[PDB]
Structure 1
C-alpha cells in the first residue's frame, strides 16, 4: 500500500481577497491546535501517511505552522505547505530549518500586474517569487499551483517561462471552479496558446502535472468548454480516494480527496467525522463508505476535480504506481 497524503485545513482566515475563493477576507478564528496535531500524528502514521500538507486559508497566518512542520518531520513525515506566498520570504528560512520538504505557492498570472489584481494584494506575486527562489536555494522542493480560466489563460506561456527561470520544479495548472457556468469566447484560441505549454520540452520548460486543464481527449475538451465539467479521474475508478485524506479542521470532516467530493442530492456534511466520541480516528467505517462511493462514482459525477488528482488516479490505473510528490 502506497504512501498516502494527509491534508489539514489548519484555518480559514486569510490575508488575500481572491475573487474565486470563499476564504477571501476571512478573519475566522478557528486554529487547528498543536494538541490536535499530536493526537492525529500517530493515527496518520498507522494509516500509512507519508506526506502532510498544510492548507486552509493562509497557513502562514497560523502562528504554530513552523512548529507543526517540526513535529511532523520528527515523526518521519514529508511536510508541505500551500501558501499565497505573501509571508513566505519572511518565514521560509525558519520553515526550511524546521524540516519543510516542499513549498507550494499559488500564482494565477505571469506577472505582479495581473496576479496581484486577481488576489487584490499588491506585492503578493513578488513575495511568492522571492520565497520560491529562497526555498529552492534552501533545498525545499518548489511547486506552483495556478488557477486558470477565461481571464488569465493567455498568461500561461509567460508564467511557464517565469517558473522555469525561477527554478520551480512542479506546476499544477488546473481550471477555475465556480458555481456559475464558465465560458470561453474562443476555445480554439485557448488550445492555440496553451497547447505549446503542454507540448514544451520537459527538460527545458516546466510542464504542468497530470491532465491539461481543458482536457486531454476531444471528448473531455468538448465537455470542459461546452458544459463547464472539469477533467477528472478517467477510466472506471478513481484511485485518489485510497491515497488522500483531507481534514477540514474547523468542521469535523475528513474527505477522501483534496477536491472534497460531495454527493449531488446530499444536504448532510460531506466526508466523514474526524472524531468518534471526541477521539481522532482515521479510516473509520464512515470514511471508507465515503471513499468507496467516489472510487466507483467519481469518474462519473465529480465536477470539481483537479488536473493533478486526475493524472494521479490515471497513473495508478495504467501503471499501478506514482512517483514521489505526484499529488
Structure 2
C-alpha cells in the first residue's frame, strides 16, 4: 500500500472573489478545530497517510493553520497548503519554521494585470510570487496550481517562464470547470500556443504535471473541445481513489479524491460520513464502497477530473508507483 494524501477543507471563507469558485466572497464561520485534527491524526497515521494538504476557502485565514502544520509534522506527516498567496509573505516564515513541506499557490495569469483581475484582488499575484520565492529559500517545495480556459490560455507561455525564473518546481495546469459548457473559439490556436509549453525542455523550463489540460490523445482533445469533458484517469481503472482522502470539513463528508467533492452527480451527500457515532473514522465500509464505485467507473463518468490526478492514476497503471509529490 502506497503513501496516501489526505486533504482537509479547513474552512470555506475566503478573501478573494474568483469568478469560477463557490467560495468567492465567502464569510462562512466553520473552522476545522485543533481538537478535530488531534482525533484525526492517529486515524490517518494508521490509514497509511503520509501527506496532509490543507485547502478550503483560504487556509491562511484559519488562525490555527501554523499550529496544524506543526502538529501534523510532529506526527511524521509531510504538510502542504493550497493558498491564493495574498497572506503568504506574512506567514511563510512561521509556516516554514512549523515544518511546512510544500506550498501551493494558485496563479491564473502571467502577470498581476490579469491574475489580480480574475481573482478581483489587487496585489494577490505579487504576494503569491514573493511567497513562492521566500518559500524556496526557506526549503519549502514551491508548487503552483493554474486554472486555464478560453480567458487566459494565451498567458500560459508567459506564466511558464515566470514560474521557471521564480524557482517554482511543480506546476499543475488544469482546465476550468463549470456547470455550463465551455467553448474555445479556436482550438488550433490553443494547441499552437500551449503545445510548446508541454514540449519544452524540462531541464530549462517548468513543464506541467500529468496530462495536458486539453487532453493528450486526439480523442481526448476532441472530447474536451467539442463536449467540455475534461481529461481524467484513462485505462480501465482509476487508482487515485486508493491514495487520496478528501475531508469536507464543514459537512461530514470524506471523498476518495480531490475532485469528487466539487461534483454534482446525485442529490444526497456524496462521499461517505467522516464520523460514525461522533467518532472520526477513515476507510469506513461506506467510504470503501464510495471509492470502489469510482475505481471502476471513474474513467467513464467523471467530467471534472484534474490533470494531476489523471497522470497520477496513469503512472500507477503503467508503472505501479509514483514519485513523492506527484499529487
Q: State the TM-score, normalizing by the size of structure 2.
A: 0.99
Distance 2:296 2:142 in 1: 33
Distance 1:11 1:266 in 2: 24
CA distance 1:199–1:263, shift in 2 (3 Å): closer
- 1:119 corresponds in structure 2 to 119
- 2:16 corresponds in structure 1 to 16
Distance 1:117 1:260 in 2: 28
Question: Could you report, residue by residue, the CA deviation over 1:145-194 in whole angstroms, capped at 9, with x for unpaired residues?
Answer: 00000000000000000000000000000000000000000000000000
Displacement of 1:264 in angstroms is: 6.6
Runs of 4+ in 1 over 6 A off after TM superposition: none
Alignment check: 8 A CA contact 1:262 1:270 kept: no
Alignment check: 8 A CA contact 1:261 1:302 kept: no
Alignment check: 8 A CA contact 1:6 1:49 kept: yes
Displacement of 1:265 in angstroms is: 5.4
Displacement of 1:296 in angstroms is: 0.2
Look up the SS of the partner of 1:80 in the other structure: strand
Displacement of 1:105 in angstroms is: 0.1
- 1:101 corresponds in structure 2 to 101
Look up the SS of the partner of 2:104 in the other structure: strand
- 1:216 corresponds in structure 2 to 216
Distance 1:53 1:118 in 2: 24
Identify unmatched segments of 5+ residues in structure 1. none
Displacement of 1:263 in angstroms is: 8.1
Distance 2:238 2:193 in 1: 30
Identify unmatched segments of 5+ residues in structure 2. none
| Count of aligned residue pairs for this structure pair | 327
Look up the SS of the partner of 2:116 in the other structure: helix
Alignment check: 8 A CA contact 2:248 2:261 kept: no
Distance 1:137 1:109 in 2: 23
CA distance 1:51–1:263, shift in 2 (3 Å): closer
CA distance 1:165–1:262, shift in 2 (3 Å): closer
Alignment check: 8 A CA contact 1:262 1:271 kept: no
Displacement of 1:203 in angstroms is: 0.5
Alignment check: 8 A CA contact 2:263 2:304 kept: no
Displacement of 1:253 in angstroms is: 0.2
CA distance 1:278–1:83, shift in 2 (3 Å): same
Question: Could you report, residue by residue, the CA deviation over 1:190-231 in whole angstroms, capped at 9, with x for unpaired residues?
Answer: 000000000000010000000000000000000000000000
Question: Could you report, residue by residue, the CA deviation over 1:85-134 in whole angstroms, capped at 9, with x for unpaired residues?
Answer: 00000000000000000000000000000000000000000000000000
Look up the SS of the partner of 1:10 in the other structure: strand
Distance 1:124 1:265 in 2: 34
- 2:284 corresponds in structure 1 to 284
Distance 1:165 1:28 in 2: 37
Displacement of 1:267 in angstroms is: 1.1
Look up the SS of the partner of 2:189 in the other structure: helix
Displacement of 1:262 in angstroms is: 7.8
Alignment check: 8 A CA contact 1:245 1:257 kept: yes
Alignment check: 8 A CA contact 1:19 1:118 kept: yes
Pair 1:172-2:172 in alignment: yes
Distance 1:263 1:11 in 2: 18
Distance 1:171 1:265 in 2: 29
Distance 1:266 1:15 in 2: 30
CA distance 1:82–1:290, shift in 2 (3 Å): same
Distance 2:260 2:90 in 1: 31
Distance 2:260 2:87 in 1: 27
CA distance 1:35–1:261, shift in 2 (3 Å): closer
Look up the SS of the partner of 2:11 in the other structure: coil
